[PDB]
Design a protein around this ligand. Structure first.
Ligand SMILES: [Cl-]
Lengths: 241, 240, 249, 231, 234, 243, 111, 244, 235
């Protein structure tokens, strides 16, 4: 059964290597979440540092692709960094060639097309990662676009990824049924982060310290990640309400 | 580029791809070459399961490489065209640089070299073809007849046959051909060639092709009626 | 470095090309899409199968513009379709518009797309595309036309057809309703009826994607002044425009 | 078993079988011995023949005026590697007017052998080498293995029954290391070392092969009647 | 690379670009020259890169048409790829990098102008790959005649009708005073939020007067040696 | 199955068995460690004395990259050398274009991407080494550890090889007992001890100690080997602790 | 415009006897009207009892001698330490020189 | 490495056969039948479309019969996509010859070159062969009217009347029975249709399931005309011969 | 399947070992070296009586001072001979001298291992290279497809090689004349050959300093065959 080793069709019209690349996604056992505000887009992810000898500052699955675009990965770190480096190069080349900053959705499509090539060409394996791109686009506003090993991509009102993704998804679905809108009706990004963390706590059923989380925030003209103290400040506000 | 080594050795010291190419030659229609005192004759079989054929335009089994050399074959038909083309090009190239047409031995050596190259080149399979190359060297009246095969070996023959049931017709030639006294005339040489094919063919109608080559670029192909006369003569003498 | 320089699609003893057959099996699993040709236009339509309700289905476009007068839709693997649309748009320029100063006719663009899909059937180190396309278009000398393109690279012109999940039933439905005197509005009506059979969940302008090849649209051109330039014949129907036609259904 | 088809494949226990099978070719090869003092370095090699009508396969190759090696295993692979060393020694001279360090020579061989063990299509080298030389930091002896591993030593031996000579040198370490300013006595110690690896056969005039390099001695090879002194 | 062709058409011209309140306007004359000879008395020098981005061209006629079409083709594919309306800076960047790569051997001198989601823009591109930004710009053999008018009458906060008047007045200065320029005045207006309107032959101040005599020959004047019907059909 | 026969092939778990098999080669190799300190880093390694015939001090395993980075590895020694050769080319081209010497995090990714690239195709074999490396740059001291998969992280302390668990345990104690920090000269002494303690898992053949270090104060930010009196002082400290 | 050749002056002289041969050459090196060195040798022992000098443009002269010395070295490696005869050396040098027929060594060589 | 997944398309069997060529011929035997008949004053090409659907656009369709130049045409049997690759190559080769010699390409020369391309895919490259069999129908001033066939092996042969695709065994027997050398085009048209009508797997032979073409010298004085039949023209010729 | 350049567990290249089996199937070739010259002789082995045996060219000239005999897949030897001849003439062009027999053999043996995944497989032919030079005098080499070459005083290759080699062991001494060596090749060939030895199915050749490399006529070899039979019957 060599049709399960390389990316060619099986008798039932399936690509097993692509399917197994999806299972590699959850190998890190980390859950991520992304939501949109009025002026911003917030992405959060669990941070697990099991070894005591690790330098926790270097342990990260969130990446700053360009000034405006940020990316969080679900999957092994080697493939994650492979994708990050390429996205950074593509975003830089786009700006040089076409004279303006690469949009979040255009980058997502580009990385998805690259992923598609690995599903069709035999010598290249798929990357075992799911890439979630976030920004505040100058035309489309707050944006969330997600890519997988199949070469599939789509925009999102909000999204979640990881082992307990389905629990987080339905938690968010039920909120937007109630609010009757496509986003988090909130002025400051600080409270949009508080919303994101709160709903992850409810869905996963776990409490978080400052070192258990990792946060990325996209505003107009800049994307940035929060420090441990920035998150701690944010956790205090949730507890006091 | 496709690099795979298709022709390789086996534990018992054989190159199976070269040997399986010989099986393709054994499947092909019979071809025979007989050389006389002042001529060479190339005989060829044509299978009679194909009626409604157009013999005007159908590719002939014997091919001219130059005005003084001819090439017949047994095995895969498509493969033979590639060898013939390469040989024809080399024949013109030799005239251009040496200012003299190729010898029959040289042309054979070239064709045999090509066949060999395909037995130890990556990404290619051997030619499923064995050839009989015949003719006369420039300003020379001594008849020449050579044979090649997929492995790349070549050699000269007083008379030889290749293709299907070739072992039967080789048996015939081995007792009927005298080294001390070969066919003295054209008629004698053609008759022996037709006789040898009649051991294998079936009917002597539109199944046998004959081509006669003589010195100084004198090559001619026989028609149906001309060949039929030899068939009619041999059968009447046989009933004895 | 790619050392797969050999064919991954080969003939089996029975004469089947396994990978093409398996690609067609992938198309069978895919969501239903259809196309109908009228006297004064062509319609192509499909269901927008949403992966998640949080996902914005507007961002994912199953119906794509290839040229101003040619559109396309698919059934099968979405990513394979996307890159084919990219390659199809580019080849329309490189191998035609940059030569003749005009957009290619439907049949020839279709021919170029088929060539790309055929090469993925024979070239080294690749699998076939896991999609079947329906390409609707118009050009001056051939008028309106509708073509289907399969993983093998084969293409056939159709009066009307359907591909994917419920194609067998959908083709039977279209045989009863299709005639050579159909107006464009009648063809849109029949398309919506045909599609309702295959769709299971919600059936509205937000879950259905539908585009037409019809009259020229000067308003969608973007400029005025040149009389010969009259605008694109390809138009994607809005969510609202679909719902209007679902009331009088 | 299933993991020895090519060099690009690891076994479940983390082994490279094609590299290990290349190592096996060295064990089948004829014995050769290397040893050094502070002033000189010596190679001693037992040459092998096909039969009594044949010549004896030459084991020692010169790389420069100050460097050379002995081989054990596939001789053509030694010719490739020794040729590469000749070029590298020569590049060092033409460009930098500098004699190539014996340590760098080892590093270059290691890196050349390694590339053949990580790529598809190619194969590992099937030969072990003993490099001797005298450079700006005195005498040197190296042991090359086609896995890539190069090791600097006082003395060693490779080939069939090399364990006998290697044990002897391990005992004699303190003695032969101090043989300074005396070539013939250092060779004698090497000839006695290789003798511990002999079975049934003894060292004859066209069988033994010796080479030496040192302080005021260029790399020179002794064969034939020139080694009759040491029998 | 070939160091110029003299045979190659290289028209004299007057093209200008003027920014106004809610957009940008470009204009041009309609003379194409071959040396001292007027080849085309009504050519179109205003080109379309995209629906709302237009391009006026001077220099080597074949190079301006070829480079504007190539970038226009790639802009269309880029617009389809990104699902966005094309920007003027994208055309600008693609043009200059192409022209720079050929080191001036592609003799295209362009005024680029258009509107996009970012706003209204006006640039000029020289053959060697340098670009300039401005509120008013002029190229061509009649650029000095046009720029003289632009420097005299241009002001900040021009209306649509004032900008069209200023632009056409600048082109007229070229038409009358420059021998390389002549015939008519083409204009293209690109306003924000509206379709771009191309005004072919906006002014026609150089109409040929009635000839003094008709030169229609009596039938049979020309001596003929042979007649024959030509077959165009299959 | 057969999923473990070829590199870059996902198993039904989502695993690349060939990379995991390369880790077994690393686990088989000798022990090597890394210790981050106040203003720099310290590296140490176990060299197995196979024979009396090995020349002491003259089979150096720790390698320098540029002038400010040290690299040590466990597993297939030639694979490590190949990796360092690439590292030197990466560091050379960085300095060529950007003038400044390559930062340690920047350098870490260059190796990471190169090692990861060897898990993408079946025409190449994964690296049979875990590499501990680091140094001092503009932003201070950094220590990294890179694995066959291409995975790397920053470390306070790092260990790999046959005695990795013993070394890891001893490293964890240092991190707990010294929260404010450990000095460079102290880290050299501790490094020696941990190698000697980790030698208990490889005690058939006796061994030779080899240490190197980068420190802003002690070595002026450059990579140097520990030799002579300072080396013997560290050995004596380690000898006293085992007894 | 860049001129890749120069004239370093000097002169050389070879004479052959019955059982011996001499190759002489002055030690002065010059450019234009200046002296570069009063003692810069240009007659070299190349091994196998062959002496060589390539007078003219010194850079090309040094390059040639360097290459011939190397040719002698590889002749020993490839042919079992065989002595390179003077006639064989001469032919080898012809191929070195003609190798750069279209960008020549500006030197008069004597061995 | 990649060796593991190589099918080895260009090798011999122990019996001396090319696996992939044999399997490609097996594929072709399931394709719609195509017949070529050569007469003294013209050539007929007839071909059966593969199980037609009622909603297929018949008039603006091309599946079986293709035009290579003004004097040469081909009938296809096998994978259409593969045939079009080869057809465009053949069209280019014909134009290269015309450009070089200012003369229309001789039929055999075009056939040989197209057959040589197929041969290449069986001997080298490691790719699968083209799953296509052609019937070439053309005219030149040397040999006059000519019929050839080529198959995936790259071997080509000349014919007076020939069939390719499905039921060739049954079709060739019927052609062999009723064919004669002094035949006219109008008679050959009738033979082609009658043969298909008997060998067809369908219930009855209709206009919408056929493609038809002739190459006559029926134009005005010493010149060749290619007629690709329209649907209505097939409907009329089917009634005129008494099949429907 | 499996790689072309793969090692066996015993430490040998599979393809090289398999090519050696092909050489054992080949026709016999014998070479003997003396102080008066080197003699080369081969078994022609015609597959059929109709085949003109004089066209069987299994002994070949490389230069005037170097000859060559072959055994195994003889078609593979054509490119080896072509290379050898070019190497010989090229060396004469570069150095104005004859090329050493050993150096020529080394040049040929460098081709041997230039195969893999360069050519697709090793050569299936062994060569006996005989010649003379001023330095090492009369020499005989055996060049294998493994890239290895041994110098031999006498050597037999082919199907009857192990039987012939054992016979050469007893018969060879350092004072053999050229005439004695010629008869010794014929004698041993007649022992291992299937068919009866004569001038048509066996060929002799030699290389001497004076006359260079010469292939013997069928008339000359016939007399040596007759001289051989008479001497064996004489005791
Ligand atoms: Cl892309």
């Amino acid at each position: 059964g060599y049709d399960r080793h390389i990316t060619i069709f099986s008798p039932e019209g399936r690509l097993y290597q692509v399917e197994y690349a999806f299972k590699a996604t959850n190998q890190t056992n980390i859950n991520s979440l992304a939501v949109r505000g009025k002026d911003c887009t917030v992405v959060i992810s669990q941070k697990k540092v099991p070894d005591k000898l690790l330098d926790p500052t270097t342990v990260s699955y969130i990446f700053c692709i360009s000034r405006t675009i940020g990316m969080v990965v679900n999957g092994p770190i080697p493939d994650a960094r492979n994708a990050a480096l390429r996205a950074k190069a593509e975003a830089a080349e786009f700006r040089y060639k076409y004279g303006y900053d690469m949009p979040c959705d255009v980058l997502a499509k580009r990385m998805a097309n690259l992923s598609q090539i690995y599903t069709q060409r035999a010598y290249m394996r798929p990357l075992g990662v799911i890439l979630t791109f976030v920004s505040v686009d100058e035309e489309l506003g707050p944006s969330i676009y997600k890519t997988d090993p199949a070469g599939y991509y789509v925009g999102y009102k909000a999204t979640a990824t990881g082992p307990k993704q389905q629990e987080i998804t339905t938690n968010l679905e039920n909120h937007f049924k109630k609010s009757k809108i496509d986003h988090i009706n909130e002025e400051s990004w600080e409270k949009v982060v508080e919303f994101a963390i709160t709903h992850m706590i409810d869905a996963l059923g776990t409490e978080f310290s400052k070192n258990d989380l990792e946060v990325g925030v996209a505003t107009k003209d800049k994307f940035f990640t929060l420090s441990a103290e920035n998150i701690e400040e944010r956790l205090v506000a949730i507890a006091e309400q | 580029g496709y690099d795979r080594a298709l022709s390789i050795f086996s534990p018992d010291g054989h190159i199976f791809q070269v040997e399986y190419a010989l099986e393709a030659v054994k499947r092909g229609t019979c071809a025979v070459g007989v050389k006389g005192k002042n001529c060479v004759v190339l005989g060829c079989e044509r299978r009679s399961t194909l009626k409604l054929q157009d013999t005007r335009i159908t590719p002939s089994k014997v091919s001219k490489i130059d005005s003084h050399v001819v090439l017949s074959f047994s095995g895969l038909n498509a493969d033979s065209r590639i060898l013939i083309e390469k040989a024809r090009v080399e024949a013109q190239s030799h005239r251009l640089t040496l200012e003299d047409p190729v010898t029959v031995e040289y042309l054979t050596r070239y064709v045999a070299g090509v066949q060999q190259r395909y037995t130890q080149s990556g990404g290619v399979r051997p030619f499923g073809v064995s050839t009989l190359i015949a003719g006369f060297d420039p300003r020379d009246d001594e008849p020449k007849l050579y044979q090649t095969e997929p492995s790349g070996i070549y050699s000269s023959w007083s008379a030889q046959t290749i293709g299907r049931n070739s072992k039967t017709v080789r048996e015939f030639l081995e007792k009927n051909y005298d080294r001390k006294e070969p066919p003295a005339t054209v008629e004698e040489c053609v008759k022996l060639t037709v006789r040898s094919l009649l051991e294998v063919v079936q009917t002597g109608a539109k199944n046998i092709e004959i081509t006669v080559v003589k010195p100084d670029s004198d090559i001619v192909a026989l028609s149906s009626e001309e060949i039929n006369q030899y068939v009619t003569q041999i059968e009447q003498e046989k009933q004895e | 470095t790619d050392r797969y320089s050999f064919s991954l699609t080969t003939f089996s003893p029975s004469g089947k090309l396994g990978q093409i057959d398996y690609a067609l099996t992938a198309v069978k699993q895919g969501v239903t899409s259809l196309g109908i040709k009228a006297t004064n236009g062509v319609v192509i339509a499909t269901e927008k199968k949403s992966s998640s309700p949080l996902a914005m289905s507007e961002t994912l476009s199953k119906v794509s513009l290839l040229t101003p007068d040619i559109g396309a839709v698919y059934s099968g693997m979405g990513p394979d379709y996307r890159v084919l649309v990219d390659k199809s748009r580019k080849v329309a320029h490189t191998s035609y518009k940059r030569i003749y100063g005009e957009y290619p006719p439907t049949k020839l663009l279709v021919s170029e797309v088929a060539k790309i899909m055929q090469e993925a059937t024979q070239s080294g180190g690749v699998r076939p595309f896991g999609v079947s396309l329906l390409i609707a278009g118009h050009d001056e000398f051939n008028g309106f036309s509708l073509y289907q393109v399969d993983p093998s690279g084969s293409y056939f012109p159709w009066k009307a057809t359907a591909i994917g999940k419920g194609s067998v039933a959908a083709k039977t439905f279209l045989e009863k309703r299709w005639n050579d005197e159909l107006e464009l509005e009648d063809a849109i009506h029949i398309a919506l009826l045909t599609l309702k059979e295959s769709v299971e969940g919600e059936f509205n302008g937000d879950t259905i994607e539908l585009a037409i090849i019809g009259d020229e649209n000067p308003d969608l051109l973007g400029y005025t002044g040149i009389p010969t330039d009259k605008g694109p014949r390809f138009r994607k129907l809005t969510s609202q425009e679909i719902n209007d036609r679902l009331e009088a259904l | 078993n299933n993991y020895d088809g090519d060099t690009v494949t690891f076994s479940p226990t983390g082994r490279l079988f094609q590299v290990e099978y290349a190592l096996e070719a060295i064990k089948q090869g004829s014995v050769t011995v290397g040893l050094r003092s502070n002033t000189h370095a010596v190679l001693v090699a037992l040459k092998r023949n096909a039969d009594e009508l044949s010549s004896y396969q030459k084991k020692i190759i010169k790389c420069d005026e100050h460097m050379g090696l002995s081989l054990a295993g596939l001789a053509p692979d030694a010719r490739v590697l020794s040729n590469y060393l000749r070029q590298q020694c020569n590049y060092s001279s033409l460009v930098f007017n500098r004699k190539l360090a014996v340590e760098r020579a080892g590093h270059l061989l290691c890196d050349k052998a390694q590339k053949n063990t990580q790529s598809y299509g190619g194969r590992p080298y099937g030969v072990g080498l003993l490099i001797i030389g005298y450079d700006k930091s005195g005498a040197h002896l190296l042991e090359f293995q086609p896995s890539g591993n190069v090791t600097e030593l006082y003395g060693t031996a490779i080939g069939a029954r090399s364990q006998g000579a290697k044990t002897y040198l391990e005992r004699t370490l303190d003695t032969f290391i101090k043989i300074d300013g005396n070539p013939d006595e250092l060779i004698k110690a090497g000839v006695e070392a290789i003798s511990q690896s002999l079975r049934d056969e003894s060292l004859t005039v066209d069988n033994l092969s010796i080479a030496i390099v040192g302080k005021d001695t260029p790399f020179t090879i002794y064969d034939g009647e020139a080694v009759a002194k040491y029998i | 690379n070939s160091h110029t062709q003299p045979k190659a058409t290289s028209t004299g011209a007057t093209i200008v670009g003027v920014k106004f309140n809610n957009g940008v306007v470009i204009a041009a004359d309609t003379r194409s020259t071959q040396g001292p000879i007027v080849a085309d008395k009504n050519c179109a020098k205003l080109h379309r890169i995209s629906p709302k981005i237009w391009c006026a061209g001077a220099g080597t006629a074949a190079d301006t048409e070829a480079v504007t079409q190539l970038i226009g083709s790639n802009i269309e594919l880029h617009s389809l790829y990104t699902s966005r309306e094309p920007r003027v800076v994208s055309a600008l960047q693609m043009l200059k990098q192409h022209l720079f790569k050929y080191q001036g051997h592609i003799g295209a001198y362009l005024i680029v102008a258009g509107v996009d989601p970012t706003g209204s823009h006006l640039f000029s591109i020289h053959a060697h790959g340098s670009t300039d930004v401005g509120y008013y710009l002029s190229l061509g053999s009649g650029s000095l005649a046009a720029m003289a008018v632009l420097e005299s009458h241009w002001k900040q906060d021009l209306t649509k009708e004032e900008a069209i008047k200023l632009a056409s007045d600048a082109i007229q200065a070229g038409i009358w005073n420059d021998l390389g320029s002549g015939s008519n005045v083409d204009v293209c207006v690109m306003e924000i939020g509206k379709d771009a309107e191309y005004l072919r032959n906006y002014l026609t101040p150089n109409v040929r007067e009635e000839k003094q005599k008709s030169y229609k020959f009596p039938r049979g004047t020309t001596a003929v040696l042979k007649e024959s019907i030509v077959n165009i059909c299959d | 199955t057969g999923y473990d026969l070829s590199n870059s092939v996902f198993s039904p778990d989502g695993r690349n068995f060939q990379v995991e098999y390369a880790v077994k080669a690393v686990e088989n190799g000798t022990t090597s460690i890394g210790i981050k300190c106040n203003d720099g880093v310290v590296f140490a390694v176990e060299k197995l004395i196979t024979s009396k015939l090995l020349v002491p001090q003259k089979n150096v395993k720790i390698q320098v990259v540029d002038r400010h980075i040290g690299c040590v590895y466990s597993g297939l020694i030639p694979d490590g050398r190949h990796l360092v050769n690439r590292g030197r080319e990466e560091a050379a081209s960085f300095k060529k274009l950007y003038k400044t010497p390559i930062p340690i995090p920047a350098f870490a990714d260059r190796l990471g991407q190169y090692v990861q690239a060897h898990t993408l195709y079946n025409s190449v074999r994964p690296f049979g080494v875990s590499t501990i490396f680091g140094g001092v740059d503009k932003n201070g001291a950094h220590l990294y550890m890179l694995e066959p998969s291409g995975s790397y992280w920053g470390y306070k302390g790092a260990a790999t090889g046959k005695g990795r668990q013993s070394a890891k345990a001893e490293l964890e104690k240092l991190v707990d007992h010294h929260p404010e920090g450990l000095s460079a000269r102290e880290a050299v002494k501790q490094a020696a001890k941990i190698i000697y303690l980790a030698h208990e898992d490889n005690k058939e053949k006796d061994f030779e100690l080899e240490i190197s270090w980068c420190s802003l104060s002690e070595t002026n930010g450059l990579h140097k080997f520990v030799k002579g009196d300072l080396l013997q002082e560290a050995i004596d400290f380690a000898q006293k602790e085992i007894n | 415009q860049f001129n890749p050749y120069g004239d370093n002056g000097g002169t050389i002289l070879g004479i052959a006897g019955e059982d011996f041969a001499v190759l002489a050459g002055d030690t002065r090196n010059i450019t234009d009207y200046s002296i570069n060195s009063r003692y810069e040798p240009k007659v070299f022992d190349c091994g196998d009892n062959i002496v060589m000098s390539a007078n003219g443009f010194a850079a090309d002269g040094d390059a040639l001698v360097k290459r011939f010395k190397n040719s002698v070295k590889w002749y020993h490696f490839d042919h079992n330490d065989k002595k390179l005869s003077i006639n064989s050396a001469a032919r080898n040098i012809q191929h070195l020189l003609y190798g750069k027929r279209f960008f020549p060594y500006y030197v008069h060589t004597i061995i | 490495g990649s060796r593991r997944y190589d099918s080895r398309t260009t090798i011999f069997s122990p019996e001396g056969r090319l696996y992939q060529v044999e399997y490609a011929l097996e594929s072709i035997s399931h394709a719609g039948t195509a017949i070529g008949i050569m007469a003294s004053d013209g050539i007929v090409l007839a071909a059966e479309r593969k199980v037609t659907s009622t909603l297929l656009e018949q008039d603006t369709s091309t599946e079986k019969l293709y035009k290579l130049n003004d004097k040469i045409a081909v009938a296809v049997a096998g994978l259409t996509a593969d045939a079009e690759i080869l057809i465009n190559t053949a069209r280019i080769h014909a134009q290269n010859y015309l450009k070089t010699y200012n003369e229309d390409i001789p039929v055999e020369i075009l056939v040989r070159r197209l057959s040589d391309i197929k041969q290449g895919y069986t001997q080298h490259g490691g790719l699968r062969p083209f799953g296509v069999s052609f019937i070439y129908a053309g005219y030149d001033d040397r040999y006059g009217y000519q019929l050839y066939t080529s198959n995936p092996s790259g071997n080509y042969t000349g014919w007076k009347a020939i069939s390719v695709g499905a039921n060739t065994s049954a079709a060739q027997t019927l052609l062999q029975m009723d064919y004669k050398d002094d035949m006219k085009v109008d008679d050959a048209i009738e033979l082609a249709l009658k043969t298909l009508s008997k060998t067809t797997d369908s219930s009855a032979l209709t206009y919408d399931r056929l493609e038809f073409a002739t190459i006559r010298k029926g134009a005005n004085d010493g010149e060749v005309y290619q007629k690709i039949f329209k649907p209505q023209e097939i409907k009329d010729i089917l009634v005129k011969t008494g099949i429907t | 399947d499996r790689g072309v350049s793969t090692f066996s567990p015993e430490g040998r290249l599979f393809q090289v070992e398999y090519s050696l089996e092909a050489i054992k199937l080949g026709s016999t070739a014998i070479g003997i070296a003396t102080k008066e010259g080197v003699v080369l002789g081969v078994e022609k082995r015609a597959t059929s009586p109709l085949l003109e045996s004089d066209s069987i060219e299994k002994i070949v000239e490389i230069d005037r001072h170097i000859g060559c005999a072959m055994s195994g897949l003889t078609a593979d030897a054509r490119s080896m001979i072509e290379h050898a001849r070019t190497a010989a003439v090229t060396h004469n062009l570069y150095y104005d001298e004859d090329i050493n027999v050993e150096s020529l053999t080394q040049s040929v043996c460098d081709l041997a291992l230039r195969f893999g995944e360069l050519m697709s497989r090793p050569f299936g032919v062994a060569l006996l290279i005989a010649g003379h030079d001023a330095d090492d005098g009369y020499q005989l080499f055996h060049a294998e497809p493994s890239g290895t070459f041994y110098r031999y005083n006498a050597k037999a290759i082919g199907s009857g090689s192990e039987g012939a080699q054992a016979e050469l062991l007893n018969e060879w001494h350092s004072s053999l004349t050229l005439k004695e060596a010629e008869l010794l090749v014929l004698k041993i060939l007649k022992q291992v050959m299937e068919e009866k030895l004569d001038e048509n199915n066996a060929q002799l050749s030699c290389i001497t300093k004076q006359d260079g490399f010469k292939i013997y006529d069928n008339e000359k070899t016939a007399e040596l065959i007759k001289e051989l039979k008479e001497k064996e019957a004489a005791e």
